[PDB]
Ligand binder design. Structure first.
Ligand SMILES: CCC#CCN(c1ccc2nccc(N)c2c1)c1c(Cl)cccc1Cl
Ligand SMILES: CCC#CCN(c1ccc2nccc(N)c2c1)c1c(Cl)cccc1Cl
Ligand SMILES: Nc1ncnc2c1ncn2[C@@H]1O[C@H](CO)[C@@H](O)[C@H]1O
Ligand SMILES: Nc1ncnc2c1ncn2[C@@H]1O[C@H](CO)[C@@H](O)[C@H]1O
Lengths: 322, 320
């Protein structure tokens, strides 16, 4: 009774919200999530926008049970008419819808954000601010096919994995996280994501979010067999950084690493004193949405693309032999 | 016990005290310093060449010496470029303006709790969607030096500052009645003018004033305004009614951009609704989703004063 229901556009189980509606933060709540969900479904199903009496999307009071109920009811009646129309007569989400889905999955999953103990700009709590856009730019730049295996080393609550799995056709996407609190929230993010993606009728690639230490023996062979590694190594100490380079040194030719800090200098010059360095077996480039034909107006951020290339070491040895 | 950033145009340096201020749970002045440096380097290519690249990768925001080293490397690069230019003002890019407006807010609104604003239109979240929707609005209405822009209920003045940085309107006004945002708007104004000079960026003339937009003085001022911006989403029926009476004195082609329409989108003039504001204005819903938008599914409303709607009704009665 004391609740609001939104029918799924594809006939999945309805989204059920209790009344009073949950509040996510000081300026964000479930009332706005309901309005935006309705708007997104109408935007991408044009018959639905035609069927719905749209005056309610102007005339609404988020603090009134009756007003919010009438808004949900108009949308649900329009869903029923469209289901009748389709009776008589499964794609990847757009970037805009995926941004909404990921936020919605986070709001239903991470109920106590204080527990994360994350005060850095890479916190799950601010993922929608810059990270989502930079991951979308990364997806467009780093071409992935069904022959690729994607791994996020230290995946937090799994946001990058969910975004990449919704956008690409990699064979599989993995997220590995060590810390207890984020790996526990990742279990809910996983269930909430699959549920919401089915509610919208959207496709995603296969993915797994797992609890683990990416420096373990099991993960050594797994990194060696990964074609695309994503790693937020910005705050990693020298030991972890060193151990990671040792793991990357076992990757196949053409294997790629995308990171927030470079693992080798951008201007690496192979000599007799730096033959041990990872720079001898990889090309490194700085990718910035500020560079190119990209219409970027966000933060002046960059990421780094590393590609395993053993010809740098091979050519130096030929120079030494001849 | 401080950090200094030299201006790329030789204005007074930006001075930050140490320990560096914290703005929120994930945002501080150390990130502001780094991003300021990155923006100046991005838009001055010789600067990016002169500066040692490692400096913006290996930094510790919690170390005075590390942050001082970072500022020093940028200041030395500014000095080399100033020497290069010795040896022989534009508008900010959208990206730089977004950074400038956040920076102006960070230095001005020290106690955001005081605003008592829990709505999505709060100054505290302006950079999230409002900034992008205002940028879309500026591209859509295409104001010239003959225009006068007025934001009715301007809060801390963010819309006025954005519009004045982007357009060549003769003047931009913000009028705010509430004490706390009107007081913060005075600081936003000073900080904006200072930061714009620091970057060497141009803006149009603007005034942020404390006042009641329903007063007699404002009645004549609204009548002489060519572009009104108003966030009327939470306005009661009395304010809404009084505003329509103000808009009814505007000139033909006068425009009102708002968060809620002042007249129905499907208004049809008849003998029973001749009193309605819909008889003298066109109304259209503008949505960035219609027409590369991936943000929130938001809309705003454009009203254009057009008394020919009323006139055609009378001429249609006399010419059946
Ligand atoms: C951890 C969640 C995330 C993300 C997106 N991202 C970046 C890179 C630099 C940034 N700088 C500042 C602020 C951000 N939010 C940044 C995000 C990223 C990419 Cl695209 C490739 C490889 C690693 C990373 Cl971490
Ligand atoms: C007050 C600060 C602002 C702004 C930009 N804006 C809107 C309009 C609808 C919105 N919907 C949801 C969320 C937002 N942030 C929205 C912002 C706006 C415009 Cl472009 C024209 C006329 C009035 C308005 Cl209020
Ligand atoms: N050895 C590790 N194995 C898996 N995740 C890790 C490990 N070390 C750090 N992390 C995680 O990496 C993330 C930062 O990239 C954080 O969420 C942090 O908990
Ligand atoms: N009569 C008025 N005069 C000036 N500002 C007002 C008036 N009424 C409301 N406001 C302001 O309009 C804004 C609502 O967008 C608030 O900042 C609020 O204080």
């Amino acid at each position: 009774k004391l609740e609001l229901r939104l029918k799924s556009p594809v006939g999945a189980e309805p989204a059920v919200y209790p009344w009073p509606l949950p509040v996510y933060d000081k300026h964000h709540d479930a009332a706005h999530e309901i309005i935006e969900t309705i708007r997104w479904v109408c935007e991408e199903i044009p018959d639905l926008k035609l069927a719905m009496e749209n005056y309610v999307l102007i005339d609404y009071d988020t603090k009134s049970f009756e007003s919010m109920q009438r808004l949900c009811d108009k949308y649900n009646r329009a869903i029923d008419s469209i289901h009748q129309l389709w009776k008589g007569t499964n794609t990847r989400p757009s970037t805009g819808l995926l941004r909404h889905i990921l936020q919605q999955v986070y709001n239903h999953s991470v109920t106590d954000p204080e527990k994360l103990n994350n005060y850095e700009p890479f916190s799950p709590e601010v993922y929608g601010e810059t990270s989502f856009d930079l991951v979308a730019q990364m997806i467009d730049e780093i071409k992935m096919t069904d022959d690729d295996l994607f791994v996020d080393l230290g995946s937090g609550v799994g946001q990058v994995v969910l975004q990449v799995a919704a956008a690409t056709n990699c064979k599989h996407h993995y997220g590995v996280e060590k810390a207890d609190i984020p790996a526990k929230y990742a279990e809910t993010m996983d269930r909430e994501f699959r549920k919401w993606m089915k509610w919208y009728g959207k496709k995603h690639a296969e993915y797994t979010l797992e609890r683990g230490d990416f420096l373990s023996e099991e993960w050594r062979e797994r990194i060696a067999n990964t074609s695309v590694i994503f790693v937020n190594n910005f705050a990693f100490g020298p030991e972890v950084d060193h151990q990671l380079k040792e793991r990357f040194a076992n990757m196949k030719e053409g294997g790629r690493i995308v990171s927030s800090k470079p693992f080798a200098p951008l201007n690496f010059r192979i000599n007799s004193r730096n033959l041990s360095d990872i720079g001898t077996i990889m090309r490194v480039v700085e990718l910035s949405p500020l560079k190119g034909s990209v219409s970027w107006t966000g933060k002046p951020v960059s990421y780094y693309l590393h590609t395993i290339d053993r010809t740098i070491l091979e050519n130096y040895f030929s120079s030494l032999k001849n």
